[PDB]
């Protein structure tokens, strides 16, 4: 391993590099050789202050204080550092003595909107205040700032995170001479404080600090009113700051407060500006705003957001607006009303033409995205898609404006009729309120309309309780790694009680034509295919609430090996979907107990090593104790003996095997 | 008051909105001068509302233009650029639609032009993506104003053709969809006209190799476009960037082959020493488009060999380029060049003893360090 002589070579090395002398290289080689010892550095300071009226040297020095510094944080780094402990304050005011004397100085609030030319000299002299500050041992810092010149401070934004790093939250006072010393420098000259660079830099530090320490944020009333007139100035108000305001509206949706700023403004700014990176950055903030909020407004209003519109595309707005749309589509809240708005913003057509601008082929496609999602206003593939067209049309009120339709379609109503029959009599149920193989696959289209397009988008988590049976089974799809009161975007029908009649017909129908184990297996097969496996998070939630629900309505003869074996395939890609993990889970575990008896075991077997013990823990080991008395149902008779499933099991839950067993 | 200077500048960019007339206007453009002085941009008092008022003032004005008035409008377009709040569409087409009349009677090296074509830039800065048809007239705009400035012998007329060709993914969008190659020939000899006028005492020489603190493939600045990310970064330290501006220059006709530069390779060929620097600054960034045989790579190597051997600074510095573009090459250069190549950073390490041969390791970086795939043996 390591040996000191390797370390006491490296001192020798050390005091020789110091003996070659090297005024900014020396005081460097004299931190190198202090860093390796955990004097020298009193002599640098001497050979620095002997040329310290030099600007570039004073910058230098300045560097160098800000990298002496970052020690204390590198080589982790942040605690427990090498570096920390390798270089000790003691013995340095010496070293220091220098360094202060040379700090000694014996419009806009930024010194360039753009790249100002060496604003690291003042960002670095900015920090050896505040590392002079610290090697001494607030508010002498901030009476100190407010009388020094407004553009010494407003060269850099590291005076903003000096301000930062007075105690805002532990000592309210001090924010409020800092808010103070602000007003009053706006009341002297309006134009140093009203720059837009200084007020985000103190507003992003205001929000670091309320993210760092739950005493920021709270006590802060008069911050709050501050940051008000601010934002009640006209510059503020017209939003004159784009990627500031951009950055300040990302600011304020990552920090659940009371603030000027709304998901739904947020959007509404982000689709204002015309810069596709600003409208980018401002759907990623939103996004990330997403998952831990109610995001109805939003997704809602994503469904009808995108448009047509070629003369935008010719500005490419609408390809701004395409890209969006596309986000959406990746966030998770209203898939289908995402695929909804990106195929009513595309032409259909011309798709070598787009060649997948911003990054479809196969499933993101808008013949996928049509096919997974249908939304009704209310050449071969024009046709294709209003055969699906004139079925809504008569699925809808408008009656004489789908037969005007269809005479213009060149297709017969009754033509169409004959095989929309079912669908006529689903949404005639549906209308109505508190109140062989053709039919058979005539009873199929009104499950599956019954299925899709009528369950609610929205789907309530608790369910009827009008069976006990139904009960019975939503307790089964509840024990293990259930979240109750799941919501989505928008509900378009809710509590359709005569699906259960429908389960009571079918039995009845055709002497229990279409009721047939395998009528329901194409149904439950057609509405998992159309969950393509590349949809969001939240229509995926919803439609395997929808197939659990289904499947509540199920009855025993659902039970046989292939339809049982589709089902736990169906569950199985629930579970590759992480939110949806925790419903496919607890669904998984009936349909199991289900197959065993039939399976009496090749695929059963092979299908037993769908755990999540590799990629809510306490559910999960709920649904690994429920998966060890499955397991020990299994092994008691151990038929084929294949399955090899109780060290696999016990692996998993964290349960020290035995040795016989392995 | 500045909250009342801004609104001043506010009224004066409604104002302006306006043709203004005949007037000259001269303390007038004094007077907008003062206000941009202090709060330009920067003010509580201004407003996106005004900002999207003066950007149309611009355009307003550029269409009633054609001295004082000149300065005013490159104050106004200042201005412009300096509120950060604009529709980047929307600011592309308004400076579409004032460049129409400004290119009418344009005066590229007149420094009043000079802010319109900053704001131009600036505007087809987030165009690129966004109302591209705009931005294209503005791109053949700025190559005819380049080829125009190129024309000049004036070294920082060179600089500013060259960084208004880069202000590039227009330019390159522009070539795709040229009319035919023959304008891309044109591009190129107006990129020839440009680096003689770099040939001129004001501008340093072009041979652009062994740049200060340059880290081959490490950073960035390899290609100069995010899309391309080719191999080979020539980082530049200022010490280097006043290299760099006719490495630009040159790179303003090296970048793009006008990047098949197989058969540009074979008929350039000239062993001129401008010729080589130009070669040697394609070459990194076009070795793999030009699928050029490891023969041509062979000779390339072979070439630049024996113009290090040559005593001459800039063709042993061109010569070092190529060496340096062919150690971290876009194309798999042949193992008896890359043998060469490695004779030749022996040879630079040797010379290297002295300190004036810092220059040997900067040059052939990737060849200096270990580029990666090469066989350690």
Redesign the interface.
Known sequence: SNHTIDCDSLQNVIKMLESSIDISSASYDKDELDKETPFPEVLSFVKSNHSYDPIINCISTNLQFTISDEPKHLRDLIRSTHFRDSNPLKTLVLYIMDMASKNVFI????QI?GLMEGSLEQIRNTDLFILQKYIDYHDSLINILHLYPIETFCFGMSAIGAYFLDVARTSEPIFYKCLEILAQKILM????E????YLMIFIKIFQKCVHSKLQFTDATLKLIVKITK?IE????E????????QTFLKFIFQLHVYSKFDYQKLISLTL??????VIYNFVDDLVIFLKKCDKTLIEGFVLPILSIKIEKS????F??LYLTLKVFLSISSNRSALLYQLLKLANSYETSTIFEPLLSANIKQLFRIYRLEIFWSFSDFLKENSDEIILVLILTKNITLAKLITSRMSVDFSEKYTQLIPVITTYTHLSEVENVELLNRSKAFLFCLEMLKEVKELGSTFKSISSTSFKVYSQLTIFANRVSFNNSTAIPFFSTKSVLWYCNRLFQELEGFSSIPSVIDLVLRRLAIQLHFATDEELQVTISFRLCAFLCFSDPFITSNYLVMIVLRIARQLLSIPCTQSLGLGIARFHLKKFKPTDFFFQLAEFCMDFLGFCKMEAIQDFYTWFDGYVTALLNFEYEGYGFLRCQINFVRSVMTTKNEW | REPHILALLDIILRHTFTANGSICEVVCLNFSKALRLLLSHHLHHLRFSDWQSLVSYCCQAIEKLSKQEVVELIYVMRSLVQWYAAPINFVSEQLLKFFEFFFYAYTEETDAHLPALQCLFQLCAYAIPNCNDYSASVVLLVFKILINSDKWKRLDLRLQLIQCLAIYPLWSNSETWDPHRSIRSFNLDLLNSSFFSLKNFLNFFGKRSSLSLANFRFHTVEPKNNIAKLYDPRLHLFFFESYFIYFFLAKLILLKKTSQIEELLLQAELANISASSFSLQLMVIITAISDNLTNDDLLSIQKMSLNFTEKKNELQSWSFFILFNICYNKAYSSMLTTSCKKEILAAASRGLLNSVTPVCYQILTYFNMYRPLCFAS
């Open positions: 419009i806009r609030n930024h909107l000259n309006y134009d140093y009203r720059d837009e660079v601010f100035k006209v510059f503020i017209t939003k004159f700051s784009l990627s500031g305001r204002k500006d015309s810069d596709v990176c010719l500005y490419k707005g390809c701004y």
